[PDB]
Amino acid sequence: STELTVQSERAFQKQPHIFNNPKVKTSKRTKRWYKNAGLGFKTPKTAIEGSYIDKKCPFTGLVSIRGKILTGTVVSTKMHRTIVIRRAYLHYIPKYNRYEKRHKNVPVHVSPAFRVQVGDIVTVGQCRPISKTVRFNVVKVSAAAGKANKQFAKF
Amino acid sequence: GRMHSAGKGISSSAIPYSRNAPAWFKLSSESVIEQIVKYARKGLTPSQIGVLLRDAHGVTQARVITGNKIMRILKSNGLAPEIPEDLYYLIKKAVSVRKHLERNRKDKDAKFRLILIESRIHRLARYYRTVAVLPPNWKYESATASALVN
Amino acid sequence: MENDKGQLVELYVPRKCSATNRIIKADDHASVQINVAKVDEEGRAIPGEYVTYALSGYVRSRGESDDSLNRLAQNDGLLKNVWSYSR
Amino acid sequence: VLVQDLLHPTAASEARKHKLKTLVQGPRSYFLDVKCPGCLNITTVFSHAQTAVTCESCSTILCTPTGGKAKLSEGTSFRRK
Amino acid sequence: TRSSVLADALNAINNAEKTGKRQVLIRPSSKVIIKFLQVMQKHGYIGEFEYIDDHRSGKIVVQLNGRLNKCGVISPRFNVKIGDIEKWTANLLPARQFGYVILTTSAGIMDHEEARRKHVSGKILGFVY
Amino acid sequence: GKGKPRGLNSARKLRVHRRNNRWAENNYKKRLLGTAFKSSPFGGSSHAKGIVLEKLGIESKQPNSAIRKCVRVQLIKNGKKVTAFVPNDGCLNFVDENDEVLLAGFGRKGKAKGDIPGVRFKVVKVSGVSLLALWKEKKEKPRS
RNA sequence: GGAUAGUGGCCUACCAUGGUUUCAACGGGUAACGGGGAAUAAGGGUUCGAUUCCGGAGAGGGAGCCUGAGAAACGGCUACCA
RNA sequence: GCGGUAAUUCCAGCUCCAAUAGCGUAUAUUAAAGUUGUUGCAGUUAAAAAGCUCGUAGUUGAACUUUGGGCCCGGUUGGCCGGUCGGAUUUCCAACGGGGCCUUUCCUUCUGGCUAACCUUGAGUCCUUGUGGCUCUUGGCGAACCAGGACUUUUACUUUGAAAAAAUUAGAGUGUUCAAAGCAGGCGUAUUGCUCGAAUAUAUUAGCAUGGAAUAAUAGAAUAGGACG
RNA sequence: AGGGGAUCGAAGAUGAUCAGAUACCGUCGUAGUCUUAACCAUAAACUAUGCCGACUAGGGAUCGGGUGGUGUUUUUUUAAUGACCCACUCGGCACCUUACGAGAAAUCAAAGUCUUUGGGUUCUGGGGGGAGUAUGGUCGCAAGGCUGAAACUUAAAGGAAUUG
Ligand SMILES: [Mg+2]
Ligand SMILES: [Mg+2]
Ligand SMILES: [Mg+2]
Ligand SMILES: [Mg+2]
Ligand SMILES: [Mg+2]
Ligand SMILES: [Mg+2]
Ligand SMILES: [Mg+2]
Ligand SMILES: [Mg+2]
Ligand SMILES: [Mg+2]
Ligand SMILES: [Mg+2]
Ligand SMILES: [Mg+2]
Ligand SMILES: [Mg+2]
Ligand SMILES: [Mg+2]
Ligand SMILES: [Mg+2]
Ligand SMILES: [Mg+2]
Ligand SMILES: [Mg+2]
Ligand SMILES: [Mg+2]
Ligand SMILES: [Mg+2]
Ligand SMILES: [Mg+2]
Ligand SMILES: [Mg+2]
Ligand SMILES: [Mg+2]
Ligand SMILES: [Mg+2]
Ligand SMILES: [Mg+2]
Ligand SMILES: [Mg+2]
Ligand SMILES: [Mg+2]
Ligand SMILES: [Mg+2]
Ligand SMILES: [Mg+2]
Ligand SMILES: [Mg+2]
Ligand SMILES: [Mg+2]
Ligand SMILES: [Mg+2]
Ligand SMILES: [Mg+2]
Ligand SMILES: [Mg+2]
Ligand SMILES: [Mg+2]
Ligand SMILES: [Mg+2]
Ligand SMILES: [Mg+2]
Ligand SMILES: [Mg+2]
Ligand SMILES: [Mg+2]
Ligand SMILES: [Mg+2]
Ligand SMILES: [Mg+2]
Ligand SMILES: [Mg+2]
Ligand SMILES: [Mg+2]
Ligand SMILES: [Zn+2]
């Protein structure tokens, strides 16, 4: 989520061990680190362009992605810097030899490299436990905005 | 079929196999697309127009002599209403029925039709709402329905 | 209904309605078989010799013995117009 | 009955059917060119008009609406096509 | 409202046969119906059929003999695991030597015998005996 | 197609509906209500031992006329009091009050045997031995 | 940040208002350790699994700890309750 | 249902029947039960359609979008021969499958690495009057997949396969004297050893991997904020 | 809670009948019956028969809409009309005859197209009593409505048809 400020905390925010020698007058102020999570996921430019901090960013932070890669549909974005997706799926009761609709919500961290609104299909990746619930991290938006601007005023 | 009744009435138009021509129909898209617009411009609903073209003139199927459905002529020329006209007319009726209900609290039958009429509105509203033609969160309320029509 | 090697096994291969080609079973005692005569030169009817039709008791009961005969006799050569394939 | 052509129904029994229950379905209305010989030129009219079709140049009349088929006015003539 | 267009077409075929008729009119046809219609015929269960062409959803006239007792539809197109197919045939075909369960696979609509030989499976559509 | 949802996803409904309807099954209900453990004089067990409080003379139901010899027993693990039949000619002469006896069911699944009203149990042993054995002559009833 | 072998509201501080639910959350019951399996034989099912193998939990009930590579151990200790 | 005086049911004697080192009885559960019904019930009068309509969840939901035709290679059953000293393959023949083409036809994609394959061909030719046949470098196939970049509308189904504990189950082999079992055993020079074994299957829901692209969803270009360059 | 309160008339009081007669029949007649503003939510609220869709069979009436017709009648001068007549077509309330078919039958054009058992979907029943009882919840001014068990008892209860 973030938005604005960057130094909005009691502790000074910084990328660990990414020194900038004040003696060397430079143009970029802060040297910034980044990587690619791998598995073929492009690291969005907003991660390399940005100045947000986030130690739980999969491109600019100290996490790794390894394990289940899942996709789900965004259903809540009220948490700051983390979301809840719903993964729906059908479930085969035998005996009746058909299925019933089930689901589970899955809480997932979300780097301010992405701007997510509710309804977006998103691909997330497996994480070291990041928080009490969260064990996943948004890792690409396979969506956009769900055609909102083609809902406008009048002729 | 028959949504809010137990009618079983199969009445309808029977459109011809002939998806073009009428061959004995001279004139031209030119002439008739313009024809649509001037009426749209008067203030008529595409339906009223499709009719006032079916009788006075030779416009059998407005989509045929002009490869377009009348409501698309209208939008394309920016003549298209706030809300679709079926929805427009449902709402317009609900208002007048309501107006009767307010002056006639004793008329339970009218209360019953209002529900019906409003229920259709609400389903329809949802359709258009689902398919972009209305904004998400477009809503119908009595309190503000009267303004919508007139 | 043969078997392992040629050999026609199990008896009675049954008749068939000439109008519906369903089986004509035993207790079907409503069914029928109509022998129409083979005629020759100047009136006269070659006896022993027939063009033969079989009709299911069903068909008869359903009132279609007569029409379904018109159509059969005609398109086998023994009716001249009478019937129509269009309605 | 029991055996027939459903692919080639006879003219007059298809004719008498309902316009949606014909083999392929189609209308059974028609258009006409009508004239009230005060004016010279002649307008195109629908057999089931709903709209009381005014004439081209004058505000005379022509046909009134009905149950179905329009009822034309006193001294006029027509033709299908 | 019209629920399984196949269902009606199948059922109609059956009612004309049972009342001894030789032709049906069916409405409204579909890819699937034809592809079904086509399987029966391939095995003699019906004559020929004409797609008449309203500018709508279609009609068909089937020409049927009498070799046909029932041609029903399986109303939820269940899934079959190529093992399971014996189970279906066994449950609704009169003997293990004629009659077909036609179904629907990646490799096309096709009776179970063909579907056996090609070695594919999928959903189950209907049957003919 | 009267009734049950036939759809391919209608599984959930189909089970719950079943769930809800087994309750009309008389001994599906018994089973999960624990009517054994809760009601029933015995635990939910095959037999139960008890103590003979008094010897009764239950008169049989119609159209039979007879006196059916029975003992009121107080189940040990319970104090639940229960009247029990004492099968075969005599045998009531084998019991006496305060004796311990082995009750057992009548094989009608709860439910009175026949013209004995109320009695849902029968005696199998007394003072540890078995009526049956006593009845024949094979064995003798213990001292005190 | 502290604590841990180490992630992690695991704990603390500051901050925010979130998290779950008729696709049954939350609560109640279970005469409930879970599985491999067992019984009943057209099939579909129904019922059962304390119990020879695998996993977990316990050592009268709780809690705490010493030693140690490994125990919150009970044929170790300490305290309370019985 | 028997017994209230000739009791085919009680108490016995005789005789008889059923299962038999075993056979009653009690409780539970399973089959019989299509009396819980997905397969598969019933509901006018036997138990059961809510007085009525609206309606959310839920389930359900008309038709239509590469079809039809042409050529190529190579498989496995089966026939009619057997060339052979029980089984063998060539051409002849069906029939049923798999693969790649060309028909206006993404195969995601550019950049080499590679080539396995012919429009090649460079000579000619074992040899049946030759397109029956393959070794064979010098202009001319992509994709068979490497690895590096740049990017990919979502799903359900279904195939095949991996990853898998044993005992249990199904089942092969072996004559524990039989059998339940067990996993042994079997040959001899039985005086200094020879040897076959200790299979196979099922293991599904989920996750993984690969083929298919019917059926059923999803997304797309309409205030063009479209698509290619 | 107002108003209205002709009539008929729960209650009650009477005349009679009766062994009795708290009744039936007769008289008086409170509430009620009607209406407004609020409640209540139940009837054998019935077709004891869910709704949507497809298909399967003959007949004559009728109700509404429609198309056709050198139909009849209205006369005026012939039309226009209106009503009537005949054929067709949709959609109604129904009746008739059938039996392809269904069913335990009575019967049923659905209650048919089901062991040749699958178009979609909702709801209810699972032997009889106990009992719509107890308990909790809830709605109601009340009366009561909705939801709704067990123990225990029991071999039947029940349905259609036949002969008596
Ligand atoms: Mg927050
Ligand atoms: Mg509706
Ligand atoms: Mg309709
Ligand atoms: Mg209409
Ligand atoms: Mg009940
Ligand atoms: Mg007593
Ligand atoms: Mg105790
Ligand atoms: Mg924290
Ligand atoms: Mg809060
Ligand atoms: Mg539930
Ligand atoms: Mg326990
Ligand atoms: Mg266990
Ligand atoms: Mg269990
Ligand atoms: Mg225990
Ligand atoms: Mg321990
Ligand atoms: Mg102890
Ligand atoms: Mg405590
Ligand atoms: Mg301890
Ligand atoms: Mg000890
Ligand atoms: Mg120990
Ligand atoms: Mg005697
Ligand atoms: Mg005797
Ligand atoms: Mg005896
Ligand atoms: Mg036995
Ligand atoms: Mg099934
Ligand atoms: Mg039943
Ligand atoms: Mg009833
Ligand atoms: Mg009803
Ligand atoms: Mg309700
Ligand atoms: Mg479809
Ligand atoms: Mg598999
Ligand atoms: Mg094994
Ligand atoms: Mg009064
Ligand atoms: Mg009185
Ligand atoms: Mg008196
Ligand atoms: Mg009284
Ligand atoms: Mg009621
Ligand atoms: Mg009635
Ligand atoms: Mg009729
Ligand atoms: Mg009671
Ligand atoms: Mg009796
Ligand atoms: Zn004019």
XYZ file of C-alpha atoms in Angstrom, chain A residues 46-133:
88
model
C 7.849 0.406 -10.290
C 10.062 -1.766 -8.076
C 13.258 -0.440 -9.673
C 11.960 3.075 -10.219
C 10.312 3.438 -6.804
C 11.890 4.498 -3.515
C 9.498 2.736 -1.190
C 11.167 0.527 1.280
C 9.369 -2.853 2.180
C 11.552 -5.724 3.437
C 8.803 -8.070 2.289
C 9.000 -6.997 -1.343
C 9.871 -10.014 -3.514
C 11.932 -7.761 -5.839
C 13.418 -5.176 -3.511
C 13.404 -7.026 -0.236
C 14.661 -9.947 1.742
C 12.203 -12.675 0.979
C 12.430 -15.558 -1.372
C 9.771 -17.225 -3.473
C 9.783 -21.003 -3.439
C 6.914 -23.480 -3.271
C 3.324 -23.186 -4.463
C 2.617 -20.593 -7.126
C -1.109 -19.868 -6.911
C -3.572 -17.450 -8.456
C -6.763 -16.088 -6.914
C -9.173 -13.198 -7.166
C -8.756 -10.099 -4.998
C -11.584 -9.658 -2.539
C -10.235 -7.308 0.130
C -7.688 -4.494 0.086
C -8.415 -2.820 3.421
C -5.158 -4.061 4.966
C -2.139 -1.851 4.476
C 0.474 -3.575 2.264
C -1.285 -6.904 2.318
C -4.438 -8.387 0.781
C -6.840 -11.289 0.866
C -7.613 -13.298 -2.190
C -10.263 -15.883 -2.625
C -9.304 -19.070 -4.354
C -12.504 -20.757 -5.525
C -12.415 -24.409 -6.690
C -14.926 -27.259 -7.160
C -14.958 -30.311 -4.878
C -15.776 -33.861 -5.929
C -18.063 -35.668 -3.586
C -18.078 -39.194 -4.984
C -21.241 -41.143 -4.026
C -23.323 -38.449 -5.773
C -20.619 -38.324 -8.440
C -20.677 -34.520 -8.805
C -19.126 -31.424 -7.307
C -19.992 -28.530 -5.009
C -18.603 -24.938 -4.969
C -15.995 -24.339 -2.267
C -13.414 -21.683 -1.561
C -10.760 -20.385 0.805
C -9.456 -16.896 1.372
C -5.673 -16.554 1.391
C -3.946 -13.588 2.979
C -0.989 -12.295 0.912
C 1.563 -9.474 1.167
C 1.568 -6.926 -1.586
C 4.550 -4.811 -2.573
C 3.813 -1.171 -3.525
C 5.388 -2.223 -6.814
C 1.804 -3.173 -7.659
C -1.375 -1.097 -7.456
C -4.136 -3.578 -6.761
C -7.873 -2.902 -6.548
C -10.608 -5.433 -5.659
C -11.569 -7.839 -8.434
C -8.081 -8.248 -9.934
C -6.886 -11.792 -10.687
C -3.423 -12.060 -9.224
C -0.572 -14.554 -9.104
C 1.088 -15.059 -5.796
C 4.123 -16.946 -4.640
C 5.136 -18.920 -1.638
C 6.929 -17.207 1.165
C 8.698 -17.755 4.430
C 6.047 -16.990 7.014
C 5.804 -13.233 6.771
C 3.211 -12.586 9.484
C 0.724 -14.672 11.541
C -1.465 -15.652 8.599
